[PDB]
Design a protein around this ligand. Structure first.
Ligand SMILES: Cc1c(CN2CCC(Nc3ncnc4sc(CC(F)(F)F)cc34)CC2)ccc2c1cc(C#N)n2Cc1cn[nH]c1
Length: 467
């Protein structure tokens, strides 16, 4: 409204006061997304963007929040005339959704850095006329809620956002941009992207948020970063507390990435009496398997990263092998470059550095080393197999000779007597990719044939003429 009952907890004088507001809103029929995002962006601004004068917590006075809320609802009510877009069946039309998107878009500053921190919230929209990509989508959903459009909800993949709406919430609409230098599809469905089996649209196994999940999204969206070196402890604590509130109420059940975020926060600063980070990573993975056909990559990446940071080479390799087993059933499309970058960095930087250190530790006498464990060699092979299988049938290739040098290096880190123990079945491993099937004999020789491996991985037809 704001309604009277929404105003009773103000002023918000602490982290716990903000948590009480979120609890009260989540207890309501429909939590107020506009209120909540304004409060979060207010406190984030005064804890991360400008801490001048800070002594404990930036007190959120009702008069301040209510004025920002009024600026938002005035802008949306004034610019979106509902009578022009009659609600057939108590659901919204594509034209209405496009109009709200246009209103948000046309309010933004003409030029700014879209990758900046702290431009995700409606506080940034109102005070700075700046939003990031998914912030635009969220703002469209908040605007629609303020207009009474109960059917418009946020849709999320692992690298993009859009809305669902209409009869049975079955319609999709693009409302924001994706990436940089991609061409805009605003107003269109996402069915072409689903049909092409791109990562970007997750084969249709994307998140369809309810209002409580939209709250979880804003909380995940909090950015504690003050600069490259420094995080706001106050914001970390707020995000963590709010994520646990949501978890207790059941609202992270269908939100794999939120469970990983929560796990990462617990690793940094554990809450007594709560599940360990590992338990939480596994719940993230279980959420993906349960609700999303185990078609998400980041639940395994979150797990692998944990094991990496804890120098648990075996378990990190297993999780990355799992990431690849997901990706293998996708086609690598135009606009999937973020997941390509993640796979590239794991294969060509993270794994090599992990195994370099394992090699040094083996020279020094380590026992139980991943490098002497044939199941760890198998995980390494499964990782490459999934990547090669991904590439099959894709409209753009994945592998090139830059990947081959690191594969030869990585294979070389395992002695032949270890590599020879893996049984490749047409420690036991089955390859799905034709590339790795062709590589099988090369993988067990005491001396890795580097040139033959390169030829097999990149399917380069020929060697050099002269020489
Ligand atoms: C944990 C992690 C990240 C962290 N990243 C994980 C994905 C998170 N994304 C999200 N988290 C909650 N909600 C949403 S909704 C959404 C779509 C849209 F942005 F709205 F469009 C995205 C997203 C944001 C943080 C990034 C790369 C990572 C890992 C873990 C690994 C591993 N292993 N990697 C890969 C890597 C390691 N080195 N270099 C890359």
């Amino acid at each position: 409204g704001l309604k009277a009952a929404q105003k009773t907890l103000f002023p918000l004088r602490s982290i716990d006061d903000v948590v009480r507001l979120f609890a009260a809103e989540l207890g309501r029929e429909e939590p107020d997304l506009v209120l909540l995002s304004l409060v979060l962006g207010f406190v984030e601004h005064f804890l991360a963007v400008n801490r001048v004068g800070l002594t404990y917590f930036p007190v959120a006075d009702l008069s301040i929040i209510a004025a920002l809320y009024a600026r938002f609802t005035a802008q949306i009510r004034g610019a979106v005339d509902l009578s022009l877009y009659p609600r057939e069946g108590g659901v919204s039309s594509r034209e209405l959704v496009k109009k709200v998107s246009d209103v948000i878009w046309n309010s933004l500053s003409r030029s700014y850095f879209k990758d900046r921190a702290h431009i995700q919230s409606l506080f940034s929209f109102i005070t700075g006329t700046k939003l990031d990509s998914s912030g635009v989508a969220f703002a469209v959903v908040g605007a629609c809620q303020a207009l009474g459009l109960r059917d418009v909800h946020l849709a999320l993949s692992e690298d993009h956002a859009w809305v669902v709406f209409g009869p049975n919430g079955e319609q999709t609409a693009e409302v924001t941009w994706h990436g940089k230098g991609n061409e805009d599809r605003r107003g269109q469905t996402v069915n072409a992207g689903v049909a092409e089996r791109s990562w970007l649209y997750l084969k249709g196994s994307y998140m369809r948020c309810d209002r409580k999940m939209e709250v979880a999204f804003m909380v995940c969206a909090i950015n504690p970063s003050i600069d490259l070196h420094t995080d706001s402890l106050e914001l970390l604590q707020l995000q963590q507390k709010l994520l646990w509130l949501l978890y207790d109420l059941g609202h992270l059940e269908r939100y794999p990435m939120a469970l990983g975020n929560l796990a990462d926060l617990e690793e940094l600063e554990p809450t007594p009496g709560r599940p360990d980070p590992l338990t939480l990573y596994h719940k993230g993975i279980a959420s993906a398997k349960t609700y999303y056909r185990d078609e998400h990559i980041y639940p395994y990446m979150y797990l692998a990263g944990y094991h990496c940071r804890n120098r648990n080479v075996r378990e990190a390799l297993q999780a990355w092998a799992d990431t690849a087993t997901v990706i293998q059933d996708y086609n690598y499309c135009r606009e999937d470059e973020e997941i390509y970058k993640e796979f590239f960095e794991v294969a060509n930087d993270v794994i090599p550095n992990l195994l370099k250190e394992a090699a040094s530790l083996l020279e020094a006498g380590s026992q139980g080393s991943a490098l002497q464990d044939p199941e760890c060699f198998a995980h390494l092979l499964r990782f490459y197999d999934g990547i090669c299988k991904w590439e099959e049938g894709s409209p753009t290739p994945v592998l090139h000779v830059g990947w081959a040098t690191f594969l030869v290096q990585s294979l070389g880190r395992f002695e032949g007597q270890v590599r020879q123990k893996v049984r490749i079945v047409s420690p036991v491993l089955t390859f799905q990719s034709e590339k790795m099937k062709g590589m099988k004999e090369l993988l067990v020789a005491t001396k890795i044939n580097s040139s033959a491996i390169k030829l097999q991985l990149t399917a380069q037809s020929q060697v050099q003429m002269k020489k």
